[PDB]
């Protein structure tokens, strides 16, 4: 029902749609019917998959971490031993979702998290342990865990989720930005200072997730990998940007490595070759 | 009669005429507007100092010489020393502004060359060292002079490769941002009207740059034989619909 | 208790499912939507914007000269450029069209190809921009080129030609990955008369090539891009 091309015959005219001036900064919406003779075709196509709700709205792996279940006797900090592990939530650590999101400078979405835990015993196990993971959403200002079993994991006001390893978690988080959107990019600082960090802002702060195994320990050591999957939903995006050409180097920075390979592919031949 | 290449822009007591122009760009088709009550969170009554700040401020002229990589300005930063607008920018905690950016480069009918004049909302710059290295405040805030993309890398400064747009994205893809061309056979001016583009309704004008103006030579400047191999590029920026909020003492920025 | 039977795929996490889930923050009231300019609803909006093609990708490094198609003065009948129309590869791979195309498997519809002339206003040229549809080779003598879809471009006060590459395909969709069955054909520019420069000017003048999509453009079956890659996870 939507027309793709219209029927157009031979034109011999002074109204020339295909000569324009791109110094104006505009793309003139020149049809194929404007410079060849066309037939009536129909679209049969709405465009529902290139919508930004569908584009940014499928689950991407955003974080992979290790926690362990072992005997915590004499371990000092319990964080280097990976008895727990917290993660400052961002969509910039793993670059596939990042290049999709850095196509805009402002994005606002409800978040959906799917947290998968897989276990592995790399040595000396008589059985596979049936473990429970606590994933505690820790907003900034909440007490961070220092032990795998301290008072912070009571989570009286922190949202927390328990799930078995091998099983997965799923919970949604609303848009928790301070601003009306998240800043994918921030040409600025937190304050006027000669040494403060550039670009890193709390305008894309989304909280933090602390992860521990609720089980005590066995004889053997269990390595539990936790994979966080983020699906954006109710996506609103603003200011389309140039796509990232160069490899990323850091979270929250537009930096690229020195001496990097050329991103434009060189031809085999001249500019005349096909 | 209705000449699309002859325009006049009057803002305040300042007027720019052009006779060799393209059509002006209004970024994302939004004209600048004041902050409405439905979007406002700050409860202060804002000051709207209309003719004294919403007027053209001509920057220092850049010389385009055949090997010029480009220039980058930061708004509101390139107007931080400009009249009453610069003073309200440092005496207030909050401020929002749209802009009419007008970039000027005249030549003859014998000259060739093309300038990408592009406005990039929140052009977060890349450090030239890579890693987690930050760009220092004084390099992201160079004022009227702007960033010369033909200059060398400095310690704490941004990367100045014009092909990667100082941010890791290719040069040809800047045309998704609201842009014009000063192609010397066609126009000598580029006019871009910028609205206030931010995820907050009003913002600090000293810690944050809303947009960047990049004037980038795409096709190199070819002068005719016997001409000086140099064209001046003059950038004239006017604030538009400028609010200021949260009046206190004058803030002290670095340098 | 309702008797239920549990089907295959129970407990699976398909990453493209769109279901409901419990909110970790009950009664949370998010920040209001203020008006931000430039709102994007659909990626078919922004690929209709023209972006520069790095069509002179004949250099060992990426620079501004990759975007500059050189013209030369005393040249009759010759070729200006040539390219195949695999829009997810080659000169198109890094353009905004070609980057969003690489998030999708199939494409359809017409391409908008622009050339901006940049030489002096007292210069002149006539060029012929040819689209060769598939099944034939890339044209080699301008006589082979004007047998296909072509625009003769007289260069004057309007510095930009807009050529369409019309959708010349038997199959309804083409792969964005280069596939030989579903190749789009070839694009080439040729000297239609020549480039005449004015006195006291010499050398090469340049063309700027642009690519965008016509409004009949289609994209489907979202997939990952081969553009960006990663070895270790990034940190702050």
């Amino acid at each position, epitope marked *: 029902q939507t027309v793709a091309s219209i029927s157009s015959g031979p034109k011999h005219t002074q109204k020339v749609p295909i000569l324009t001036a791109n110094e104006t900064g505009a793309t003139m919406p020149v049809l194929p019917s404007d410079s060849i003779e066309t037939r009536t075709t129909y679209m049969h196509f709405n465009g529902s998959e290139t919508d930004v709700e569908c584009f940014l709205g499928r689950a991407a792996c955003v974080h992979v971490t290790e926690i362990q279940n072992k005997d915590a006797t004499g371990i000092d900090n319990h964080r280097e031993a990976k008895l727990f592990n917290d993660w400052k939530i961002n969509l910039s650590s793993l670059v596939q979702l990042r290049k999709k999101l850095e196509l805009f400078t402002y994005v606002r979405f409800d978040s959906e998290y799917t947290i998968l835990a897989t276990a592995s015993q790399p040595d000396s196990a008589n059985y596979s342990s049936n473990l429970v993971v606590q994933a505690m959403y820790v907003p900034p200002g909440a007490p961070n865990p220092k032990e795998w079993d301290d008072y912070t994991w009571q989570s009286a006001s922190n949202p927390s989720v328990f799930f078995k390893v091998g099983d997965t978690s799923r919970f949604s988080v609303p848009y928790v930005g301070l601003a009306s959107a998240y800043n994918c990019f921030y040409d600025g600082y937190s304050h006027d200072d000669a040494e403060t960090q550039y670009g890193i802002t709390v305008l894309n702060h989304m909280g933090s997730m602390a992860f521990r195994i609720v089980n005590e320990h066995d004889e053997h050591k269990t390595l539990v990998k936790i994979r966080v999957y983020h699906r954006a939903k109710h996506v609103e995006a603003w200011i389309p940007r140039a796509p990232r050409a160069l490899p990323y180097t850091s979270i929250g920075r537009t930096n690229y490595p020195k001496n990097t390979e050329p991103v434009i592919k060189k031809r085999k031949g001249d500019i005349k070759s096909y | 009669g209705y000449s699309d290449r002859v325009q006049q822009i009057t803002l305040g007591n300042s007027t720019i005429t052009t006779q060799e122009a393209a059509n002006a760009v209004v970024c994302y088709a939004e004209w600048p507007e004041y902050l409405p009550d439905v979007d406002a969170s700050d409860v202060n009554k804002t000051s709207k100092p209309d003719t004294s700040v919403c007027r053209f401020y001509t920057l220092d002229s850049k010389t385009w010489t055949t090997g010029s990589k480009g220039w980058c300005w930061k708004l509101p930063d390139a107007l931080k020393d400009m009249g009453v607008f610069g003073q309200n920018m440092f005496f207030h905690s909050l401020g929002r502004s749209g802009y009419t950016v007008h970039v000027q480069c005249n030549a003859t009918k014998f000259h060739s060359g093309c300038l990408l004049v592009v406005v990039i909302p929140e052009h977060q710059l890349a450090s030239h060292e890579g890693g987690n290295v930050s760009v220092k405040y004084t390099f992201t805030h160079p004022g009227e002079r702007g960033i010369d993309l033909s200059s060398a890398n400095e310690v704490g400064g941004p990367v100045k490769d014009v092909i990667y747009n100082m941010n890791g994205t290719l040069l040809g893809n800047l045309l998704i941002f609201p842009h014009q061309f000063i192609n010397l056979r066609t126009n000598n001016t580029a006019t871009i009207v910028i609205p206030y583009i931010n995820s907050v309704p009003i913002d600090s004008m000293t810690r944050h740059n809303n947009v960047s103006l990049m004037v980038i030579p795409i096709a190199p400047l070819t002068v005719p034989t016997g001409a000086t191999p140099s064209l001046p590029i003059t950038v004239t920026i006017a604030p538009m619909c400028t609010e200021f909020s949260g009046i206190r003492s004058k803030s002290i920025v670095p340098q | 208790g309702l008797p239920t039977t549990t089907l295959p795929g129970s407990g699976q996490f398909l990453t493209t499912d769109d279901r409901q889930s419990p909110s970790a923050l009950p009664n949370y009231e998010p920040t209001p939507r203020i008006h931000i300019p430039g709102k994007v609803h659909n990626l078919l909006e922004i690929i209709q914007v023209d972006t520069l093609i790095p069509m002179n990708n004949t250099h060992t490094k990426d620079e501004v000269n990759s975007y500059l198609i050189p013209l030369n003065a*005393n040249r009759q*009948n010759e070729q200006v450029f040539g390219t195949n129309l695999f829009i997810g590869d080659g000169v198109f791979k890094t353009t905004l069209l070609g980057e969003i195309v690489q998030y999708y498997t199939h494409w359809s519809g017409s391409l908008r190809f622009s050339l901006m002339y940049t030489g002096p206003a007292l210069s002149s040229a006539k060029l012929i921009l040819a689209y060769t549809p598939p099944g034939a080779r890339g044209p*080699q003598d301008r006589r082979e080129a004007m047998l296909g879809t072509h625009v003769v471009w007289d260069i004057g006060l309007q510095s930009t030609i807009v050529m369409t590459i019309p959708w010349t395909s038997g199959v309804q969709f083409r792969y964005t990955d280069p596939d030989t069955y579903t190749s789009a054909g070839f694009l080439s520019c040729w000297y239609q008369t020549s480039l005449i420069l004015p006195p006291e000017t010499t050398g*090469q003048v340049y063309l700027l090539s642009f690519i965008s999509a016509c409004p009949d453009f289609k994209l489907r079956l979202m997939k990952d891009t081969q553009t960006i890659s990663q070895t270790v996870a990034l940190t702050e």
Partner: antibody
Amino acid sequence: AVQLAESGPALVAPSQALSITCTVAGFSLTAYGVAWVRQPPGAGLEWLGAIWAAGATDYNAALKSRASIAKDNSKSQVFLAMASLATADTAAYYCAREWDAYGDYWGQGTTVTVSA
Amino acid sequence: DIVLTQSPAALSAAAGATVAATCRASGNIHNALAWYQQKAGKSPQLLVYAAAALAAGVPSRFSGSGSGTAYALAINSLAADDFGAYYCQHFWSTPYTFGGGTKLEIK
């Protein structure tokens, strides 16, 4: 394999007409230009001229009124012709192929000595 | 017409050393400049086209640099293969004039 074979008389009296052929293999003259460059022994390279990929010729600004370049597309041959030979024309005459508009794929050349 | 000034006429050097030949131009070449090497009794061989980009099979110790009117061919860690006359030619705006040439003698 791109090959350009120069073929001349290699010994010619002065005040005569010179003629070098550049036999072309591996490409067509309709698609690539051919440049001519000489080198007298000891002295450096001098660009003689170029015939472009369709017929149009550009010449050395000193030698334009005596040099002439033609070609034959169907025979894949390029014809450098020189008139009124001086003893400064004693050189190794090379032919090239247009390579991104630069000169490349140089032949072995022909030593052409102008003497009596 | 553009006249290329190539400097110097000769440099006597040894292997491992670093050699820079410089080509100046009367007019702006816009990087449309080529570098040729030539061994004794051989055809000239294009090393660096477009004033910075190495040609096919040219080893990675040659490096062209410069823009505008000043162009410099630098050799980092010169080897035994790298001896002979070197030439600069511009390919901006026919006539495509050469430089004067630069010899390299074994020290």
